[PDB]
Each structure stands twice: as C-alpha cells, then as structure tokens.
From a paper:
The ComR-ComS receptor-signal pair is a regulator of competence for genetic transformation that is broadly conserved in a majority of Streptococcus species, including those pathogenic in humans and animals. ComR proteins are members of the RNPP (Rap/NprR/PrgX/PlcR) family of QS regulators, including Rgg, which are prevalent throughout the Lactobacillales order. Once activated, the ComR/XIP complex binds at the promoter regions of comS and sigX, thus producing a pheromone-dependent positive-feedback regulatory loop and activating the SigX regulon.
The native crystal structure of the apo-form of ComR S. suis reveals a dimerized α-helical protein in the asymmetric unit that resembles related Rgg-proteins. The observed dimer interface between the TPR domains appears to help promote crystal-packing in this structure and the two monomers exhibit an identical conformation (RMSD = 0.192 Å2). The monomer is shown in Fig 4B, revealing that ComR S. suis is comprised of 16 α-helices divided into two domains. Helices 1–5 (residues 7–72) constitute the highly conserved DNA-binding-domain (DBD) and helices 6–16 (residues 79–304) comprise the tetratricopeptide repeat (TPR) domain that is the predicted site of interaction with XIP. As the active form of Rgg2 shows a domain swap of the DBD domains, the observed conformation of the ComR apo structure appears incompatible with DNA binding and would require reorientation of the DBD domains. All residues at the domain interface are conserved or homologous, polar, and create an extensive network of hydrogen bonds and salt-bridges that stabilize the observed conformation, showing that this is not a crystal-packing artifact. Indeed, relative to Rgg2 the DBD of S. suis appears to be held in an inactive conformation to occlude helices α3 and α4 from interacting with DNA and possibly inhibiting dimerization. Although the DBD is highly conserved, the TPRs diverge significantly so that only one side of the putative XIP binding-site pocket exhibits sequence conservation among the ComR species in this study. This creates a “conserved face” and “variable face” on opposing surfaces of the cavity for potential interaction with peptide pheromones.
Author numbering: -4 to 304
The structure:
C-alpha cells in the first residue's frame, strides 16, 4: 500500500507534518499529552516536525504511529531506511584511527565531504546533528552549531540525560555538549552537569548495544581533553579503566597506542612521575613494532622527545 500504488502525491517534510497534525488533533490529543515523558519524542521536536522544519528519525516515526494506533507504513507509506552508501560512510568515518596515520585521516575527511555533498541535506534531523557532532566546534556560548541554534541542541541534550539507554546517535550528540563545557567556567552549571554525564557514560557500558561500544569508548576519550582544558584531572584515571575494559570486550585494540600515550601524559604532566610515564611510552612503541607501523612508531618516538624539553 505505497503512495505510487495508490497514485497519491509524495509526502515531503511539510505535507507529512501537516498529516501528523491532522491525525493527532482528530484523536483529541495535544502535543503535551502526545509526547508524554518526552524521551523518544519531545514537544519542541514534534512542533518542528508538524511545521515541516524537521524530518523525523525512524524511532520517532515509529513512536508517532504506535501512539496513534497505526502501523509505521500506515502513517508513512513511502518510508525508506537510510541510504546504504550513507550508513557505510558514517560507519567508516567513526571507525577510522587518526593518531599515527596521516593517510587514513585524509580518507576520513574525504568521506565526510561525500556525506555533505550527497546525503546530509536529506537526512532526518537527529542524524544531521549527529554528523555535525563528529567535528563541529562551537566558538560562542550563545550560538549553536551550523544550521541548528542552541535551543534545539539543549532539547536534544536534556532528552539524553533522562534516557536510561543511549543509542548510537545519543553518544555522538553528547559530544556537542562537551564543546559548550569548553567555553564555560569551572564554577558553572554546565560543568557540574558535564561531570554527571561522565558518570552516566560509565554506567552505559553494560547497558548499550555491544555493537555501539566503539562510539562510547571514543566519547569517553573526548572527555579527557575537556577535563584537561579545565585542569580537573581527578576523573581521568576512571576513564582509562573503562576505555581499557571496553577495548577488552570489543577486542578492537586500535586505540591501545592512543590510550597508552594519554596514560603517559597524565603520569608525566599531572603526577610529574616520568618513571611511571616511560613505562607507557615503551608499551606504545612495542605495540607499533608488533603491528609493523613505522609512521606510528616514529610519531610515538617524536612525541616522547617533545615531552622531555
């Protein structure tokens, strides 16, 4: 029962929003009643969907349908899942180890451009924000990212803090909240919140899908830099514990050198104990020798030299 088979007009963002409103209204529900606890779908998120300014993710359409008693395809007959080429590019981008490889970091940004050229403009909203979360930087505390103003992102952030189980896009979108922490004082609300996020991310390890663990790992590593920018070194060791325990379950091992460097830097610059630091330096070298990556080995050798001036 597709739109092409009934010969009807295709529902783009506006005219779909129009339908979602109709069905909600005629079922005597208001936005506040409809969204309920706002975990899956928020009131602000719904308003923009009805307005035609935001395209819903699969999980959101699913919820909108179930909440109206309808099937997914009864609501959106012409629904299609995310392009296979897009989902591949996203996956490759997120799984690229950058440190030590100049060549792979070049393929990474190449993929990102292909995403922006071909698929980004037609993704659902949550998916756009998650792609931006990969490498967008916020210059100003008042402003948002490109395309999206703060009030949107806040709504997504608040949604995630309440969630019991983070999806892959939640683990990405959180990374934008970190860019706001960078601009705020150590005394701020935003910072004390950011510490609660770290607490959440730890508990998420034994809750999220096994397959998503690699994104969580890298999100926890993003916190180390941020904690460093505020000289709040206390929770860094526990991050390392968790990152190592994730590396064990996943059997991924690509971040072993990155972690060992970060471990030496803590020992060297925070603890000022370069007997303990040199140990991790040697692990990273041994690793780079075993996988036979000269570039990585030379990078590790160089950084160690730089850090003893």
């Amino acid at each position: 029962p597709r739109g092409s088979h009934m010969e009807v007009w295709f529902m783009n963002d506006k005219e779909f929003g129009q339908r979602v409103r109709q069905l909600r209204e005629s079922a005597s529900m208001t936005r506040e009643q409809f969204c309920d606890d706002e975990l899956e779908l928020s009131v602000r998120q719904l308003t923009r969907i009805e307005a035609g300014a935001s395209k819903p993710t699969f999980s959101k359409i699913q919820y909108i349908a179930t909440r109206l008693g309808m099937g997914l395809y009864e609501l959106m007959p012409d629904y299609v899942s995310l392009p296979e080429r897009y989902s591949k590019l996203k996956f490759d981008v997120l799984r690229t180890p950058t440190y030590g490889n100049e060549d792979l970091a070049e393929k990474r940004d190449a993929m990102m451009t292909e995403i922006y050229d071909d698929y980004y403009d037609e993704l659902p909203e949550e998916e756009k924000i998650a792609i931006d979360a990969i490498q967008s930087r916020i210059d100003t505390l008042e402003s948002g990212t490109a395309g999206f103003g703060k009030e949107i992102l806040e709504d997504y952030f608040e949604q995630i803090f309440r969630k019991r189980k983070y999806e892959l896009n939640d683990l990405l979108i959180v990374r934008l909240h970190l860019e706001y922490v960078r601009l705020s004082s150590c005394d701020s609300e935003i910072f004390r919140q950011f510490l609660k996020i770290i607490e959440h991310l730890h508990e998420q390890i034994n809750i999220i899908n096994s397959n998503d663990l690699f994104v969580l790992r890298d999100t926890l590593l993003s916190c180390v830099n941020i904690l460093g920018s505020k000289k709040y070194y206390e929770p860094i060791p526990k991050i390392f514990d968790s990152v190592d325990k994730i590396i064990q379950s996943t059997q991924d091992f690509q971040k072993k050198p990155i972690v060992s460097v970060l471990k030496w830097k803590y020992a060297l610059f925070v603890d000022k104990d370069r007997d303990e630091a040199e140990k991790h330096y040697l692990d990273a070298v041994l690793f780079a020798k075993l996988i036979e990556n000269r570039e990585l080995e030379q990078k590790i050798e160089e950084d160690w030299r730089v850090d003893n001036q």
